[PDB]
Design a protein around this ligand. Sequence first.
Ligand code: 4HP
Ligand code: 4HP
Ligand code: CO
Ligand code: CO
Lengths: 384, 384
Amino acid sequence: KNPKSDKFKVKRFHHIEFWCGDATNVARRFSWGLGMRFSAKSDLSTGNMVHASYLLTSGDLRFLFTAPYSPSLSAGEIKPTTTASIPSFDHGSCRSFFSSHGLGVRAVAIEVEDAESAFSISVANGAIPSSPPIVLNEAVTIAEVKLYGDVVLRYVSYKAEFLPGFERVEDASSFPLDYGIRRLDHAVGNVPELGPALTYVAGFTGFHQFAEFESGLNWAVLASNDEMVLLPINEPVHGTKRKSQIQTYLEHNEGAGLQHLALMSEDIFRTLREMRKRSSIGGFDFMPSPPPTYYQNLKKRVGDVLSDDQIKECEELGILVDRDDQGTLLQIFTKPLGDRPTIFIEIIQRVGCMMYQSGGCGGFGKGNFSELFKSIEEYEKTLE
Amino acid sequence: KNPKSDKFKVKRFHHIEFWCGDATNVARRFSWGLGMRFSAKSDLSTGNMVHASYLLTSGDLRFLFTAPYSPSLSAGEIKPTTTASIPSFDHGSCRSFFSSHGLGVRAVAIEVEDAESAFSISVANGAIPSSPPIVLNEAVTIAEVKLYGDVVLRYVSYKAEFLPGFERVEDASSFPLDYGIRRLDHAVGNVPELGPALTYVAGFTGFHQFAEFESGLNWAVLASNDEMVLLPINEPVHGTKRKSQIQTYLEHNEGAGLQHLALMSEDIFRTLREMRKRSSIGGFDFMPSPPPTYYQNLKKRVGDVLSDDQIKECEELGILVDRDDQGTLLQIFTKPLGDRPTIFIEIIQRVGCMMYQSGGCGGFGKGNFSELFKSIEEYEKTLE
Ligand SMILES: O=C(O)Cc1ccc(O)cc1
Ligand SMILES: O=C(O)Cc1ccc(O)cc1
Ligand SMILES: [Co+2]
Ligand SMILES: [Co+2]
């Protein structure tokens, strides 16, 4: 059931902006850990006296890292005279976000046909405005509305290189790292109440509930017309034996925010080999692999989709496999990206649903809760 | 002229603490860029609900990275009931330091015979107290006094593994990186007025002016009795054609602070080869190398100390060479470690003055200003 009810033309995920305390160290860590190239910059060397902003890219995936300078550098400026390249940036807002949440995503940006129209229709339909539409060098239009917590949904539209005022980075400083990551598949938010969050966001976007298929959480996925922009939202479930992971997120994040980014790889095995080689030399750590029970039980579930050799490669890399009625999903999760048990990353690859591949092919891993529990119980048995 | 006037027994440099917004990403970046091992941690997994602290080590060099958690995690605590492993840590002080200065050194820590006595004598002699002496698990004593700006001089003494409450880090997560860095040689502060800063610090430590040997700055070096603890201090000189680099520091740092850390390598050529291989894949960038004029003029100055082959290796690595009347100094400087043009790192190796090597053997590079200017002028000539 896809009603195609988008209230404005949405194209694709455009970028993810992290608000940092020091953008340089986060961007260099992410570049090496994920194999993303330094591609654009806006900072003191480009005339930006307000914020330091560094763009990493892998395929179509764009990660932006931004941190404020001393406000004293731009004290003479006013918004009309600003040297910031992102006019929605605010020293106070950024310092407050980072002190409240630690390292985290500030903007989920989507490209649309007309950012000014997307903003107006959204706000007309209940969206809480964050930054009004602003035209940059008569070329790009940027606008922001609240999504959940302190995360904004950012609309970008081009009349026709990232943003005006950004410079492509020098060749020597731009090493062509690539571990196979190609685009952002989905971006997941954690909220205290799922119902009102769903009603708010679906209310101003016209996004529809994506069709899917007792421990932890409840969730639902909002989707654009072609289901290429996908936004799952989680809420905690209280009363369980094990403390809900969503609740722990909310406590350590000081409220709602973005929980994880799901990054599509064109070759998840090569991606994971490359990231795992760097886990202890400045990259990212991964969640503990499931027990070999899980991989023993993979044969009857996905034996028609993956060969026994490709299954064994899943076992040594710790990859999880799930399947719906239209496709199969390979996935794995990192440990938290920063000091707090909050934001993390998922690497995925989808197989099936070719027309191009349709969005969400394979779902989002819903059946992995039951299969993992069954695996831990059967592994204990296999141990005793 | 070494009066040996230390007012308390000072041993060696013990560690450098960075105050960060996210300690995880800075520590992983530094570990890979400098080849330092993850060795100890104090964080949520060790019961610390206050700050995340990660220790990197290479030889005797200890880099500590600390960032605050949400204060809500420790809201029920009081100083007697604290779970912090560094009792001088304060949420407000840290957030204020980082928002004012960006990424930077908060503590220069020196090991002394008795931290409580060092604190008392210092304060008796004009030192501005920062954190009174605190005994940790009846094993280590920690105290802090103001050094310059918001940097503290930290005294540590052991009755007899970094600090109580820290845990050695798991073997898998601890990769034995080593590029040859072995200890901290000196730590340099930038201040607006050199005279009063010298008088304050020498006044409460009894440190003496280290004997050395028109553009930029004036400086002087304070030294402990055996001249193993070395603390140079710079002030800007105004009125020059080129804006003083010390003045730019003060503006972007919002005042006085630590300008650079000088790290001794046992093999500066191997250190620089290893760091330069990683400059564009998440490590550190280096200042532009001097012109080959400089290396052409190296023969007559240090031709008795380095061979023509060892000189050519200096040329391709960009190393600078200086010499006093007792030793020779190999040095090189990184670009700023973070977003701001503030803190950077120096890699050095000293040759000569063996008794063990005496401290400061070769000086601190004073003659490199004249030689670099002469080189740029002779290179322009060689160009025309
Ligand atoms: O997949 C989701 O919808 C989000 C999510 C996934 C795993 C998890 O443990 C918590 C939330
Ligand atoms: O060496 C010093 O005493 C500090 C310093 C060195 C080089 C420089 O450009 C500025 C300060
Ligand atoms: Co997911
Ligand atoms: Co120096």
